[model samples]
Target: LGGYMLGSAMSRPLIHFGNDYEDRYYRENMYRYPNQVYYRPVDQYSNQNSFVHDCVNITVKQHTVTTTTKGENFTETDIKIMERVVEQMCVTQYQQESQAAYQRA
Candidate 1:
């Protein structure tokens, strides 16, 4: 879960900035994921520590199903419930980070 969240963050920048990079190698070799891929620029200055920031928005939705109680099938509705749970987790993380920043101030 953490990995996918981080992947989302990392890929966001690539999708935002890589609009001009149409080279086959850059497009195909830069990023790979189970259902998504992307590209971005890396900053090489500032002791090679600074990062160039941007944003990319990519997502894939695949339908899946489960059977229960005499073979009734349920698919995206179950997944959508989980999506709400993940949303809460993200909100909690943001609240924690905000509180920490406030305390540090």
Candidate 2:
């Protein structure tokens, strides 16, 4: 997850800023002036070092669940319920961290 997240962050600037307004500039300029150069600054919340800094100080939740095969397996309802649970967990975790950071600030 960390690797993918960082990879997404690294590619985000390019994915967002690589293209022209409507490819019209590229057609007119012949790929000379329509180019984009993105620079990822080494700040407190951007680069891998800052990511590692936050990751080192982060806390994770632990959980254990019991499952039974006697009933149904991989049902739509079960999957939906699990998805909702995961979403709620992530939302709550983000809220908790944001509140903590706000309080600190």
Candidate 3:
């Protein structure tokens, strides 16, 4: 473990000098399992009334409010459209954060 490894003992290249599909499959799985070292539990997001990016580990956090008195209150009829806007709000933030985190990794 301490000495220089011989050439044959070096880590093998994944796609080259090997069967491509099988090597790619192994390479893909190798990346898949460990890269998901960051994931959130689905059960923790149990609230239907609020939108919260509570996975504080990911990046800068944001939140969305479903209802507020912006000098006007929203009813169930009005709330759907509000949700449409809120849906847009939350997802755009999420996309940027997702990309940023992926690039950071």
Candidate 4:
């Protein structure tokens, strides 16, 4: 029970700064459970890694009964819940990276 969305991270298409691109590809973050994932930039030269919190992903799974015969298993309730979590994760990641950037600077 999983799916994906193409975020702004997919907006990148380059060759020069292609190593360890924290923002270039879809590398699943299994460490982040409940099917959580994140996106961030890798261009240290531009110091644009702040995308660390700029983009987000929301993955919500509902395992309950919601059908008559035709299938339509969706919920605005879950969307709101996931939206909150998504923002929180984005903030937390940025907080840590902010400190790291501060230190390096």
Which numbered prediction scores highest in lDDT against the true structure? Answer: 4
For model 2, give the RMSD to the true fold.
18.2
lDDT of 1 by residue, 2-102 (tens): 22232222221222223443332223322221112111222222211111111112211211212122243324443323222222323333343345456
lDDT tens readout by residue for model 4, 1-105: 122322222211221223353322112111121223254422343332244323333322211122111353234443333333443444454554466567776
> Of 1 and 4, which scores higher on TM-score?
4
lDDT of each: 0.26, 0.27, 0.29, 0.33
TM-score of each model, in listed order? 0.28, 0.31, 0.30, 0.36
Off by over 4 Å in 3: 1-67
| Candidate 2, poorest ten consecutive residues by summed lDDT | 6-15
Clashes of each: 3, 0, 0, 0
Q: Write one digit per residue (lDDT tens) for candidate 3, span 1-105.
A: 122111121121222216465444334322221111112222233432232222211211111121133243334533333333333323343453355456665
Worst 10 residues of 1 by lDDT: 47-56
Regions more than 4 Å wrong, model 4: 1-35, 41-54, 57-72, 102-105
* Clash-forming residue pairs, model 3: none
Which candidate, 1 or 3, has the higher lDDT? 3
Ranking by TM-score: 4, 2, 3, 1
Candidates 1 and 3 compared by TM-score, better number: 3
Residue runs of model 2 more than 4 Å from their true location after superposition: 3-72, 103-105
